[PDB]
Amino acid sequence: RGEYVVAKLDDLVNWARRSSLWPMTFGLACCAVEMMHMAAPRYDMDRFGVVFRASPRQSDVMIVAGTLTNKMAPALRKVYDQMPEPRYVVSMGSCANGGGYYHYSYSVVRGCDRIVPVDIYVPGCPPTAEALLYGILQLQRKIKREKRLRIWYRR
Amino acid sequence: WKPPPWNDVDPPKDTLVSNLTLNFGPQHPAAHGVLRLVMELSGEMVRKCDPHIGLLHRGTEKLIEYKTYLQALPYFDRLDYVSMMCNEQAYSLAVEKLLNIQPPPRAQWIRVLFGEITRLLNHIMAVTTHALDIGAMTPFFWMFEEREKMFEFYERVSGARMHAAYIRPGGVHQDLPLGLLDDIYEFSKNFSFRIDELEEMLTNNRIWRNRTVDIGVVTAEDALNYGFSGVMLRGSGIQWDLRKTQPYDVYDQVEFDVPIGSRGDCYDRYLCRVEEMRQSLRII
Amino acid sequence: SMMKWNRERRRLQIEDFEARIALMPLFQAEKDRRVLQMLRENLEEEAIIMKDVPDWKVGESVFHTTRWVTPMMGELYGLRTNEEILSATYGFIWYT
Amino acid sequence: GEFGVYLVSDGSSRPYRCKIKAPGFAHLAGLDKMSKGHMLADVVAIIGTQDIVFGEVDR
Amino acid sequence: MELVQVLRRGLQQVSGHGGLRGYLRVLFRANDVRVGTLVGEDKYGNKYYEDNKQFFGRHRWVIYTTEMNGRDTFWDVDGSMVPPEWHRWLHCMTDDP
Amino acid sequence: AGRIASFLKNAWAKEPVLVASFAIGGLAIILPSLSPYTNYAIRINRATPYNYPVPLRDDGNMPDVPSHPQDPQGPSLEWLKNL
Amino acid sequence: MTMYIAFILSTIFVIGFVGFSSKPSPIYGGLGLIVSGGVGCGIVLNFGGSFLGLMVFLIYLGGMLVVFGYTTAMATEMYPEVWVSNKTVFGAFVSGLMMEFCMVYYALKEEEVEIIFKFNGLGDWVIYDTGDSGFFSEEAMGIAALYSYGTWLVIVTGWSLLIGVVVIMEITRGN
Amino acid sequence: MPLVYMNIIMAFAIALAGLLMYRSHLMSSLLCLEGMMLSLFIMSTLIILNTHFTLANMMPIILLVFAACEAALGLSLLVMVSNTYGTDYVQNLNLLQC
Amino acid sequence: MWFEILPGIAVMAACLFIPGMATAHIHKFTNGGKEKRVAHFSYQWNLMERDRCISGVNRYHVTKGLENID
Amino acid sequence: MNIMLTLLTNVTLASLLVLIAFWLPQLNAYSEKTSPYECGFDPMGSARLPFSMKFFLVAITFLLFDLEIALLLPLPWASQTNNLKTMLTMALFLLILLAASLAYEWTQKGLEWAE
Amino acid sequence: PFFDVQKRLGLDLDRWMTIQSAEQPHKIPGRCHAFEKEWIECAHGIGGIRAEKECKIEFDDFVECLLRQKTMKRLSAIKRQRDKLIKEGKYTPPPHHLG
Amino acid sequence: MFMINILSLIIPILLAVAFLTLVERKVLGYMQLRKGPNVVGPYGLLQPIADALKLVTKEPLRPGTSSISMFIIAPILGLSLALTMWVPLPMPYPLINMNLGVLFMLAMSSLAVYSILWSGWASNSKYALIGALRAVAQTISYEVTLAIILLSVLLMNGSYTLSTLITTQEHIWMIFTSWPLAMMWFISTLAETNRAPFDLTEGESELVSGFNVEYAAGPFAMFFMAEYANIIMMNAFTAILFLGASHDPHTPELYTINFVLKTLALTITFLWIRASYPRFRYDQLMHLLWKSFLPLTLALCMWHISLPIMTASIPPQS
Ligand SMILES: CCCCCCCCCCCCCCCCCC(=O)OC[C@H](COP(=O)([O-])OCC[N+](C)(C)C)OC(=O)CCCCCCCCCCCCCCCCC
Numbered sequence A: 001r002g003e004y005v006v007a008k009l010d011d012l013v014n015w016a017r018r019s020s021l022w023p024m025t026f027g028l029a030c031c032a033v034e035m036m037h038m039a040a041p042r043y044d045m046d047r048f049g050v051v052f053r054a055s056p057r058q059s060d061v062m063i064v065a066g067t068l069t070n071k072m073a074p075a076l077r078k079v080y081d082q083m084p085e086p087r088y089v090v091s092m093g094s095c096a097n098g099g100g101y102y103h104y105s106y107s108v109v110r111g112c113d114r115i116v117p118v119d120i121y122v123p124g125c126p127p128t129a130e131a132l133l134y135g136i137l138q139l140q141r142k143i144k145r146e147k148r149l150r151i152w153y154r155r
Numbered sequence B: 001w002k003p004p005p006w007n008d009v010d011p012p013k014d015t016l017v018s019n020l021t022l023n024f025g026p027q028h029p030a031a032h033g034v035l036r037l038v039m040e041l042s043g044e045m046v047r048k049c050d051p052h053i054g055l056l057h058r059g060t061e062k063l064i065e066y067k068t069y070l071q072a073l074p075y076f077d078r079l080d081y082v083s084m085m086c087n088e089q090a091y092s093l094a095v096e097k098l099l100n101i102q103p104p105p106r107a108q109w110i111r112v113l114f115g116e117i118t119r120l121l122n123h124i125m126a127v128t129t130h131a132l133d134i135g136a137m138t139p140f141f142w143m144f145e146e147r148e149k150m151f152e153f154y155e156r157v158s159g160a161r162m163h164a165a166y167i168r169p170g171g172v173h174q175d176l177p178l179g180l181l182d183d184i185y186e187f188s189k190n191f192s193f194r195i196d197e198l199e200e201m202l203t204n205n206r207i208w209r210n211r212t213v214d215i216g217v218v219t220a221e222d223a224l225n226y227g228f229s230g231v232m233l234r235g236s237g238i239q240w241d242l243r244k245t246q247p248y249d250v251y252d253q254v255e256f257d258v259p260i261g262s263r264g265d266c267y268d269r270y271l272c273r274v275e276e277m278r279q280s281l282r283i284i
Numbered sequence C: 001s002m003m004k005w006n007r008e009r010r011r012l013q014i015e016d017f018e019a020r021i022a023l024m025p026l027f028q029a030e031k032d033r034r035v036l037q038m039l040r041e042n043l044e045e046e047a048i049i050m051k052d053v054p055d056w057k058v059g060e061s062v063f064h065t066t067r068w069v070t071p072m073m074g075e076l077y078g079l080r081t082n083e084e085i086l087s088a089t090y091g092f093i094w095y096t
Numbered sequence D: 001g002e003f004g005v006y007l008v009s010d011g012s013s014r015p016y017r018c019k020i021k022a023p024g025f026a027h028l029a030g031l032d033k034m035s036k037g038h039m040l041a042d043v044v045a046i047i048g049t050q051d052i053v054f055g056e057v058d059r
Numbered sequence E: 001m002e003l004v005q006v007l008r009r010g011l012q013q014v015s016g017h018g019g020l021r022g023y024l025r026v027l028f029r030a031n032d033v034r035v036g037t038l039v040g041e042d043k044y045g046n047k048y049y050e051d052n053k054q055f056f057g058r059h060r061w062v063i064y065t066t067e068m069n070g071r072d073t074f075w076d077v078d079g080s081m082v083p084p085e086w087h088r089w090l091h092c093m094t095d096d097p
Numbered sequence F: 001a002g003r004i005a006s007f008l009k010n011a012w013a014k015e016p017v018l019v020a021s022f023a024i025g026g027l028a029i030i031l032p033s034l035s036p037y038t039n040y041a042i043r044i045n046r047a048t049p050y051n052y053p054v055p056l057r058d059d060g061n062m063p064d065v066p067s068h069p070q071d072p073q074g075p076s077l078e079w080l081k082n083l
Numbered sequence G: 001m002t003m004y005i006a007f008i009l010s011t012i013f014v015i016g017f018v019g020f021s022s023k024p025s026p027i028y029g030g031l032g033l034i035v036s037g038g039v040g041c042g043i044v045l046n047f048g049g050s051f052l053g054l055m056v057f058l059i060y061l062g063g064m065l066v067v068f069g070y071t072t073a074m075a076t077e078m079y080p081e082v083w084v085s086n087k088t089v090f091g092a093f094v095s096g097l098m099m100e101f102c103m104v105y106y107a108l109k110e111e112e113v114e115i116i117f118k119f120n121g122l123g124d125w126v127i128y129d130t131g132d133s134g135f136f137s138e139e140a141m142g143i144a145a146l147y148s149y150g151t152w153l154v155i156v157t158g159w160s161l162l163i164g165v166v167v168i169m170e171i172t173r174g175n
Numbered sequence H: 001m002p003l004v005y006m007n008i009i010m011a012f013a014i015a016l017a018g019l020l021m022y023r024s025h026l027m028s029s030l031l032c033l034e035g036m037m038l039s040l041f042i043m044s045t046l047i048i049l050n051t052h053f054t055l056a057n058m059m060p061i062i063l064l065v066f067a068a069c070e071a072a073l074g075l076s077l078l079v080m081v082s083n084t085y086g087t088d089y090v091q092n093l094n095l096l097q098c
Numbered sequence I: 001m002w003f004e005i006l007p008g009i010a011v012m013a014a015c016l017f018i019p020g021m022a023t024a025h026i027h028k029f030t031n032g033g034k035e036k037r038v039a040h041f042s043y044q045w046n047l048m049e050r051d052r053c054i055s056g057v058n059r060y061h062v063t064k065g066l067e068n069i070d
Numbered sequence J: 001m002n003i004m005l006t007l008l009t010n011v012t013l014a015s016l017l018v019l020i021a022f023w024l025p026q027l028n029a030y031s032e033k034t035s036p037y038e039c040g041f042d043p044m045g046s047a048r049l050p051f052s053m054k055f056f057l058v059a060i061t062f063l064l065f066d067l068e069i070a071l072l073l074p075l076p077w078a079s080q081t082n083n084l085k086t087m088l089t090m091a092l093f094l095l096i097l098l099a100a101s102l103a104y105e106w107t108q109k110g111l112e113w114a115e
Numbered sequence K: 001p002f003f004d005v006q007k008r009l010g011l012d013l014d015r016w017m018t019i020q021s022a023e024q025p026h027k028i029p030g031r032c033h034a035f036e037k038e039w040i041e042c043a044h045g046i047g048g049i050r051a052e053k054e055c056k057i058e059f060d061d062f063v064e065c066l067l068r069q070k071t072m073k074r075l076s077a078i079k080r081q082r083d084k085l086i087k088e089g090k091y092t093p094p095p096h097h098l099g
Numbered sequence L: 001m002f003m004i005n006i007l008s009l010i011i012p013i014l015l016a017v018a019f020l021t022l023v024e025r026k027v028l029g030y031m032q033l034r035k036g037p038n039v040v041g042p043y044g045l046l047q048p049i050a051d052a053l054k055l056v057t058k059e060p061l062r063p064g065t066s067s068i069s070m071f072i073i074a075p076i077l078g079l080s081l082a083l084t085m086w087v088p089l090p091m092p093y094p095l096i097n098m099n100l101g102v103l104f105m106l107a108m109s110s111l112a113v114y115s116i117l118w119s120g121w122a123s124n125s126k127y128a129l130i131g132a133l134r135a136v137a138q139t140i141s142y143e144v145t146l147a148i149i150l151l152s153v154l155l156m157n158g159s160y161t162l163s164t165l166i167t168t169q170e171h172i173w174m175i176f177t178s179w180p181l182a183m184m185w186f187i188s189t190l191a192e193t194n195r196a197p198f199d200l201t202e203g204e205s206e207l208v209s210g211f212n213v214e215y216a217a218g219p220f221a222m223f224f225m226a227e228y229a230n231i232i233m234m235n236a237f238t239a240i241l242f243l244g245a246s247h248d249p250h251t252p253e254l255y256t257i258n259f260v261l262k263t264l265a266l267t268i269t270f271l272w273i274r275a276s277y278p279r280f281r282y283d284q285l286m287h288l289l290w291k292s293f294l295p296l297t298l299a300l301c302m303w304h305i306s307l308p309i310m311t312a313s314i315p316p317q318s
């Protein structure tokens, strides 16, 4: 029936969305160079199918990597809106997650989620490279359990 | 109607050129994600550049007034986040100086070993990341495989990958796991080849030189007066190095050849760094 | 090596051209018969259709001289089909 | 470069004020004199060799 | 001759992975066709391997089970599926299972 | 002499490119004058019969032109196949 | 259709000319002209001018008009003055689409159009000439005569072009 | 005369009119200049190819390489105008007056 | 190792294979086994128009020789 | 016949390619999404200013050289002439005039364009 | 020319191309070589105004060879009458018209 | 059956283009001790499909200050030229046997710069505008050496007919006669094709993405497809030009074996270079071409115009 044909169509879209999401690392602090270590041939997320792409209009998922300050806050938000749909943000590190070490200071926003709708929370200070790689695996697993076409069919 | 000017040089109008204030960064890849560089341009020619810093400003010193000395130690690990152990070296040396307490000689030798290992950590990204922005991308992964190896060494001793929290006032927190000196020795033997790998890749390449040679040159006096330090002075021929002039810890009981350049441009510092890589390997 | 090869091609070209030279007599004679025959077919059609024109004597020599002129292609294929016209005007021209 | 820490101890068990000499701070200060008479595609080059990490220059 | 041995080793991979079915299974489930000695098995179906010939890292590895705590995991893969007592050995924190 | 050799070597020290191009341009402009094959080049170029050599009316007393395209009379290019 | 294919090609040529002649935005004016530049070569190609047709593509389509885009990129009038921005350019465009549509209708009925010159509305194919060109492309042989008989022309053309780079620097030097 | 020939002739005339009927952008005026010769180049090829004037085939290029040289002057004069005045406007190109 | 790249370019060999094989075989198939007789000059074109007219089936590629003349 | 058909078929295949690359992925839009991107900050208002002379200068020099190379395409056919001596003298004359314009251009600052 | 320097020193600069009946590459003709040769030799050593009227037959024939105005006017009337005749259906084109 | 042949040429070219990104990613990756895509399908065979249809399903945002119509015609022009680049290629028997194919091929390649100019203008951003102007001045500067090299190289061929190149190279590769021009040609194509070190047009590190700074999803694919399509055809053009191969009339298959193998190998060198050399700078880019490339090309053209007369080895025009 239509339910079966819509189940395979979104799966076909589901395949690419979980295998071709080009990430962006908003290089902020030691979390960023930690991401850069997963870029080493040790892990090479490119083998999963994701490549570091600049020009936020081209990317699908953007990773906050480091501590967020009020100065950095308006720019990080506005670049998030111009990021095309679907757009997912991954909080890497305690500072990005909830401020971490800089959670009480006068010039850090407590948690990056106060600015953007965080999809995946990656703990760590810094999160080890494969631990952040694990978060990317979760994001594809979360992407797998989406019902965009199913919802529209029942909409 | 007015009579024409006598010299026929009709008077020039208002300025019809602009300096095009450009908002470089932070999303721009070359801006380390966190830079607000703004500068003025007459065409490609640049007039002035304002490096608007602050996009990563944190309390740091503000909270140190409220954290104890032990609690304040991890702050330095996150200060110069590429040189993990070297910052704690500064803090531990300072704090133990006030306490008039000197660490045991075994602790001193551990600090210098990881300090120069940290010197390998920092210098690798310093050149490779510059190689990323300059173009050719391969040197990054080319050597970041090695960066994982002493990162694995960091984990074996302290227990964490980056922020070791190892160098504490009074020495080091823990002792090395048995055999750790052996594995780092294996890395040390093979690492000099990897340095040769880079020099083969970049040193004689025309494209790298022409994008680097005779670029950003400074005189010795301005470099010193500008408060510069380390390679920024040694690249300009300034004869100075803290480990040699004021040997802290056990740096006096070891010899190393400070790589003093004689041009001061971008190229001299690059050769100064790669030799510092080899001279770091001497310390290991 | 390229010097010797190019000289050989020039000998090959003149050999190819010489075959064309021998082929000119038959080709010229065949085209000579064809073009004037097809012109006569045009004139024969002219004197079945211009018989009713108040003043149209068939075969007016538009040029004043009695010297032969190569038929302009308009009066040659003008009364033929669309396929004949297209294949003749730009037939060589198209030929991708 | 020269990473120095200047702290004042009040005699208690906690630091009273700690100022850190960031090598990038002086270097980034001199970035203006660096860029004089150079290409825009060279400002990235001089920035690279200045060994600036903003966690250090921004304190 | 050397290329002949390498081709022979390539065919031995298919024989080692239970013929054609297992070779296609692991390739489309783990992107790995390298076979090592069996080293252990938890009470979950998580086949564990080990091959000292490989360099540090890939020298010991895993293919996860198909059924985990009443959950389908044939296609999807997770790193936390590893039980704790075996997580110690897998990450080379201890070279004895 | 001494200046010329020094200048050429000194120029070939900083720039190898333009001295090479000047050598090539200076060379290629010379050999065609002294080349012994240019006369051959025009001869074979003239030998190519693009158009048909229309026959001439035989009124007698021109033995040079042959009466048949096999007779020894007329232009011959036995050099061509050997060249 | 293939009866009057060159009728079409020349027709787009006229409307392409009306485009930039209607004084639109310079970038769009370039678009209208290059469209006319592209369609014009097809007219030449239909007549056997393969080399001449390809030239305007190489030195004029992808040549002259490319550096024109720089001056348009240099001028950058403070608002785009494109077709919708002004109303007289629309009137220029609408007008420029009128007479050639009017006269082609005038032409196609009685073929007796006498605007300035006596013009026939007959099919494009007629004026062609019948006869083989053998193995030598008539266009190529004529162009290759530059270095055979066009000796005087090519010296003057070369000298003037040499003066061309002399003047360009001198005027652009700005003392 | 063949309908094709009149199309280029009227193409020139409207192109020449666009060159003469100014507006506010001598950019657009210049665009009418090479287009005006483009019709000349196109038309010249038409007769020359049609009539088998073999040596005349040189002339379309000769017209081309020289009308192109005028662009070198015309655009270079433009930036000179867009330097002392900044823009490519024409109504402000009246400093001479008296 | 490096041979895992080979399947990536092995497919490429197939992709670039198709245009070459097709235009070769379509030319062969359409033109009765022989390749497309090209006419870079007007001479070769009017050669075909003789062939097309002389074939009696209005196709140049149909070749008919000594079996016709008497 | 086949030529503009090849242009036609390629043009269509491109147009359907962009057509379903627009309507099919049409989901939702916002002003911020359509806002210009300038390194992640606010655009102050630009792309409406002239760029000195150097880009223009190299543009004009290219055209002048491009027009000179336009004069020397027929050389492969020119080599098939009967009087080669007239050809090689004139063809060389074009070539060193290319050099002369470049040589003049070089010494008078020229290709070391403005800054 | 205003100063016929070409005639004085006898070096040919432009007149090799000025007419189509002169020497041509590979000895191939123009469209109207026969007519232009006739008109040219009619109007040599005569005078511009004298040859304007005396060599009138040659000029118009050569012009008609080049433009081909009246000849295709003949064809246009032929076609116009044909379409005004076969549409009403009095005469049918023979097979050789349609092949 | 001409239409089917047209499809039989264009989809396989596009199919090869998609797999380039895979081999681009993988050959690059292995060249730097990495692995490249190997999870999405066997050895990443399905990665281009995953990449392609994701960008197809990604919403194509148009900038607020866009000319929409110009924002669309430019990618159309870019890809349409890229496919039409292949119609005169001498692939055993060339599809469109244009006697002036080389002139045709140059004209379309030069016309490709209109995509760059309109891309920056329609985007209407300072970064896009300068990136486009920087891009176009790079390529238009490199046209002159592109045309001169062909004029010199083809001078020993006989004409501009691309099919005739096979006859000239029947015995030895054309590179042996003009190896100085072969590297002269190869670098200029690299600058034309906009690959590292000539990536200032894109400037992944310092110019964001150049003309593709805003182009996303749908209209980005055309530029990305047009870019990579030109890579093959330029390498294919170099393959036929200098690295010629024998062609048996009774077996055109063998020539296809050689041509495909050569052109894929030449493309391999393209990203091989991209993985070895740092990015150029404009002044170096402008200076290198007009100070060390033009004079050398001019002299070499002078060498090759006189050489056939020097050795009486002029080639037949037929
Ligand atoms: C009788 C004999 C007649 C002929 C003899 C000819 C002379 C002898 C041969 C000379 C060498 C060949 C001609 C010159 C070639 C170099 C031109 C040049 O400008 O060089 C210096 C140039 C410029 O060097 P530069 O900029 O350092 O110095 C130039 C000189 N100054 C400083 C004064 C300006 O070199 C380059 O441009 C470097 C390469 C740039 C491109 C980057 C990618 C390179 C990839 C290389 C590997 C792949 C090669 C593929 C080859 C083709 C395969 C099919």
Ligand code: SF4
Binding pocket: A029, A030, A031, A065, A066, A067, A092, A093, A094, A095, A096, A100, A101, A124, A125, A126, A127, B078
């Ligand atoms: S979470 Fe930890 S590692 Fe990450 S930026 Fe904050 S302090 Fe640094």
